[PDB]
Amino acid sequence: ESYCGPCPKNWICYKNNCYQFFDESKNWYESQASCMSQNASLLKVYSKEDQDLLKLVKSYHWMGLVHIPTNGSWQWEDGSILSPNLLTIIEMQKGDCALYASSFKGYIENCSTPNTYICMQRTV
């Protein structure tokens, strides 16, 4: 349509999804919070086609992808399990969180390490 889905005032809207980038460096946890503070969450990656615009992202930022030891898989901060054939994850810094980098990459970082982040919120 000629109008882009419901989104927080002054956020980036693309194909009905809303995004926002924050310059303020923070740790994963403190970042996870920043998102929830605005009824959202850390960037979640479900479609290479719908989140097409993610290829234009410069540098790396906090993503909402966590790692659970018990099992040994990566799943989103909500509950969702990273859908195969989306992100190529790379070991950068020993840790349990991951940062997003251009062309669907996920670099592992120490959740305690401050960084910039991306908050997103879907539509129905």
Partner: protein, 275 residues
Amino acid sequence: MEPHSLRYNLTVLSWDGSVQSGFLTEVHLDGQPFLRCDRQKCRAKPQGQWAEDVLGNKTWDRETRDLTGNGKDLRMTLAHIKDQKEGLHSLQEIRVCEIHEDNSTRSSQHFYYDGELFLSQNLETKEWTMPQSSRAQTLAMNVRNFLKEDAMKTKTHYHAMHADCLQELRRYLKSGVVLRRTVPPMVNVTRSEASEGNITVTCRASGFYPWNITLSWRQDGVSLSHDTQQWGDVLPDGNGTYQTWVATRICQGEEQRFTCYMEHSGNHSTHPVPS
């Protein structure tokens, strides 16, 4: 005279394959320590065009903004270099440009792994080059492929890289931050006492810049052999200038027959032995 230059030297580290958060970037201007930037901010190293400290620093925002981005990118680059050796590892990306007298330029990009060079690109010709080493070639391909496929570096990225360095060199020179001035040497001729009708005359030139200088003794105006003279090295002062000296043995009495000839940045002077 030598060319104006700018050099950025970025360094990232990892311990047991774990890329550390902090990184350092050293900026050198015309061969002098100019900037130091950690993961957070850039700070000036002493001696400016000022000599106090209050200088308009905050413009260090520009370098802070950019050197951090490159710092972060280089971390992703180290991450793709998988090495099976415990301990520390380092990766450096050195970008450098120059402006010669004729205003022609020179510019390159070099990668160092654990202190050794392994890849480089002449940013003028855009032609990559790598050392003739089994180990160096593996590293090289790893990085060159990451820059192609993952980093998505185009032909234009390198055209801009070339421009960036050159425009910043010009920005620093055009702002007068670079004060390369000639400092003519001070010249002093002294003698030792006659230990058998012979004396050692010494010609000392000090506190000068630039580094290049010609000093030599002459008999009746004709320069002596290099073997018949004692030459001192060229030593840094501790003030940004240099000192050196030359000497020779003469039969006492022939004194006014000897002279010290010196040429430093356009000036050619002659100095007799004190009477």
